[PDB]
Design a protein around this ligand. Structure first.
Ligand SMILES: [Mg+2]
Length: 260
């Protein structure tokens, strides 16, 4: 038996609602849906977005109005939900959900965009370091972990359409790519690349004339697992045809643990 988990940066939950989000959600039927960039006060969402039949929903908004925010809809209730790393400046931006599903912890993370300033690039890299300390603590205690969301970095040249022109911009800086190398070396696996070694596999396209149509994109959105759990990953894919955001959704199917 498997669970289908989807991750999607929706570029505003109300915005994607107006384009057909609930119809997509009903057709795709994920067991767990992780969203990034909700951008809304949960009590200002229409009640048909706030609560969807068959799911429990959890919203973790930023302090700043209209900014960031993550959400999770799940057909099975988690046993707990942790919304921070325990560091105030990383925990007030609506970026972190860590849901305990007993088989695994599920991290749904909106990692910072560092492109607007050196200040925010430094915040991104420090957030990366706090995340790595957190997941290692949980993994080392004996938990399996699934990490999904918008990492805001394309790992290798194959992961964006125009690597050479982006050497010096956040999203493809050597130091950001090197952090992903370090995360993987700490015993985590980029699940998409377990199954797909092809070029042109992107999850974000700038909201500009025909960029998506021309597939001028970046792979910014990932599903990682700890190494010891990778044999339970059965599929990891990109839902590239699903419109409505500047990112598309990505999927993971994970087999349930089979106790003996
Ligand atoms: Mg965005």
């Amino acid at each position: 038996a498997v669970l289908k988990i989807i991750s999607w940066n929706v570029n505003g939950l109300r915005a994607v609602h107006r384009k057909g989000f609930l119809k997509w959600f009903m057709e795709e039927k994920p067991d767990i849906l992780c969203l990034q960039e909700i951008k809304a006060a949960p009590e200002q969402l229409p009640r048909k977005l706030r609560h969807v039949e068959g799911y429990r929903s959890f919203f973790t908004p930023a302090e700043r109005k209209g900014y960031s925010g993550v959400a999770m809809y799940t057909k099975v209730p988690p046993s707990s939900l942790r919304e921070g790393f325990g560091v105030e400046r990383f925990d007030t931006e609506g970026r972190i959900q860590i849901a305990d599903f007993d088989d695994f912890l599920l991290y749904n993370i909106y990692f910072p965009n560092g492109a607007m300033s050196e200040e925010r690039l430094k915040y991104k890299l420090e957030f990366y370091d706090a995340f790595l300390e957190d997941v290692n603590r949980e993994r080392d205690s004996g938990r399996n972990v699934i990490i999904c969301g918008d990492f805001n970095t394309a790992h290798r040249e194959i992961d964006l359409a125009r690597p050479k022109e982006n050497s010096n911009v956040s999203g493809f800086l050597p130091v950001e790519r090197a952090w992903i190398d370090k995360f993987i070396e700490n015993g985590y696996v980029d699940t998409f690349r377990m199954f797909n070694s092809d070029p042109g596999q992107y999850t974000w396209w700038s909201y500009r004339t025909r960029a998506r149509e021309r597939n001028v994109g970046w792979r910014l959105d990932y599903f990682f697992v700890n190494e010891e759990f990778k044999g339970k990953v059965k599929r990891s894919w990109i839902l590239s045809d699903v419109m409505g955001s500047d990112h598309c959704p990505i999927g993971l199917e994970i087999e349930l643990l089979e106790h003996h």
